[PDB]
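Margin note from the TA: students keep mixing up input and output lines. Inputs are the sequences; the output is the structure of the whole complex. Example:
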Amino acid sequence: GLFPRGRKVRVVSTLGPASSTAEQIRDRFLAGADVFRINMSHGTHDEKKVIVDNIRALEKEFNRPTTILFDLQGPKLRPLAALTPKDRKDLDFALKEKADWVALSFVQRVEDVIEAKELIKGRAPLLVKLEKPAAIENLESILAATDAVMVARGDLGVECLPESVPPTQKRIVERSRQLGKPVVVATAMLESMIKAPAPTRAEVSDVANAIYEGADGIMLSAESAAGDWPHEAVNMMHRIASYVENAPGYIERVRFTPTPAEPTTVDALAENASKTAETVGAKAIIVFTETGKTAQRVSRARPVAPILSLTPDAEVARRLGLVWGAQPVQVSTVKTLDEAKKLAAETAKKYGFAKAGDKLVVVAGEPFGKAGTTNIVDVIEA
Amino acid sequence: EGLFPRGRKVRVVSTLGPASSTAEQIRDRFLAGADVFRINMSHGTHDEKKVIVDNIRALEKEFNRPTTILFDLQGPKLRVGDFKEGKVQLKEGQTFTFDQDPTLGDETRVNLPHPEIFKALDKGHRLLLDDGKIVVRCVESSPTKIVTRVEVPGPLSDHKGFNVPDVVIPLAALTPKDRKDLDFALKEKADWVALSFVQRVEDVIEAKELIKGRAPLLVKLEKPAAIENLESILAATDAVMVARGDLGVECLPESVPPTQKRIVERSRQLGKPVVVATAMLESMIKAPAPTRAEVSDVANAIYEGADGIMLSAESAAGDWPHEAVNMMHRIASYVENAPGYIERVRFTPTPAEPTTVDALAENASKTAETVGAKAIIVFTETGKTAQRVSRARPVAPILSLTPDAEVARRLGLVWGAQPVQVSTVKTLDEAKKLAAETAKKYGFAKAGDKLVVVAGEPFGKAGTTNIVDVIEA
């Protein structure tokens, strides 16, 4: 039951002493972990390389793209620079290791996102950790410049009142969804499970309420990195999403946040592919995407129907691991609409979303092979 | 100051116990933000409760505020018997038998000393033991023997508790101990009485017949039977508690949040005060500050629009009960006054019933917004009009003026009701004058501010609400 997962929220799982061997990483991944977070504050580049090779090993065993998020420590203290000399080193290592996502801590203003992106030079997309009062005041600029977002509540409730986090969280998730930036809720989601094999009622509520906000991602930190029960913690995350997303009241709450279309072809075809899929009862929406942009726009609409994001670029498939519901599948380059239709039907049947005769909605760009050319909605039979 | 008005409308239910019992302590929690005091009748003696009750009630003179006391009755305590070695290991897929033999148990057998289980448990039904840590499934049942297959193994020790999620059992929700505790609660003039082990509407009817209208009835929703029967139980009850601790044992813990969404919605639409309970600030049993998940949990109950948010051991038994109560107050003050709050509350529709009072509850709220009113003063003899206006969840704060001391206490559990006991009025002008002088005395309005008054023209008569009146203070 590894792919599909039966839910669309993404589980982010931090690795560390309790979750670091190949067998341990394999086990989290089967238990429900989708994105692995490597924290560069501690440990050595030597130990990360073994962990990276052990995450990537999984692509061969299960034929699925993995997703690795390198977390730069930032100017932890134990008015100042966005990337410390330690970060610039750890970054260069993360890009050696073909980081799918790089995260940056303690941003306070848009110029710090810019500094990072200028160093990164397109080699990896950027996620911003929002945890400083200034970051919240500069929220619109920061969110515009970033590619993805983490509501990093641990530090946020240190430097801001802890009672200010929930409204600030609602604000970050809303706006992230509206801007189309994947957003992850973080810190203490299952804190009690560091020591106990089962969660508290308040912890399960927090996870469910992150899902109902429509967030792309829910994270575990020390519950998988350092605790006595990492496998149960990861699995409880999967169990909460499996149930909540398929229980009554889910989509109504997700739809509370309006995500209207920009005046573009891609946003128009994303919205109307979703609606068309609802109206005809389609079993899936298949999105052909060179760089992932289209898949992100469809994901933004939060369709009921399952998405499958078909890309030729193994790095895009890896990156899409963080995007709500994206379900990336690396494929060969198709060269005709006919070939796209046959590949779309066969992919939906193979992973169990459809059987011959079922409706499918295909979003694509024709003539094929170029990014930013999305212009077709095609309703086909599997 | 920070006491009345509190600066927020949700109500804090704090459980009293060893960590919060002395006069000075009970006073502290009141000031810290606690609104309803929950007295659990399962432990302790009446003589000690009487001391606590008197200590709660003493607040009324110090602060000229009505207090509110919720008495929680334990209900049935289902436990297995004892084992020869004190415990056993149950291996998956083994046969395990429950009978009425008192002989000391073993790896195959234990006494289940509750005859009522043997009258309802049948094939396919589960028994959960040790807080759901162990699951067994009935493969065979007779009036005197229950044979099970172990589905989820683990240790099983002497007189562990168990749960019967899948079938209603012919056992009263009020035990003999509960009946006696109830009479003590009513003699102590309980403002609210809390029923446990609710399975069917008949359990609520039974409880209200014993109570003979001496206090309103809150039902705790713990058991899959009660969720199946939600509508009939909600209709019959006066208030609700989402008792998550037992719900998450008897159902999947991952299924509580959608079931909490459902309970809170229907409770608002039916006009029944609803409380969210269990582990909201659980880590503060040992720590002086909460986790992020915990603060999110309290805030998400507030955004659902629930009337109340509750602490159990955090205030009853923990090391940081003052900080725990205060933290509930801090989360409510910040969230209700921060952006995003009213929109989330309004997601649950609460349309007017076809009654004069429901139409006027709605009219007043809409009128308050349009004219910029500072308060909505509600005159009420039994509390009914207060609830219906509370139900509309208006932006403008409510002041619920009642002549009756008992009504003023009970309303302490109603969202934003802000009860004030006052003198009777006999004309409209007397009501307007009393309404303006009350809004000014507590800081809601200054001379010239607009207020919306909701009242009934035959003054002094319950059920007569028929007036909305805009006035200047």
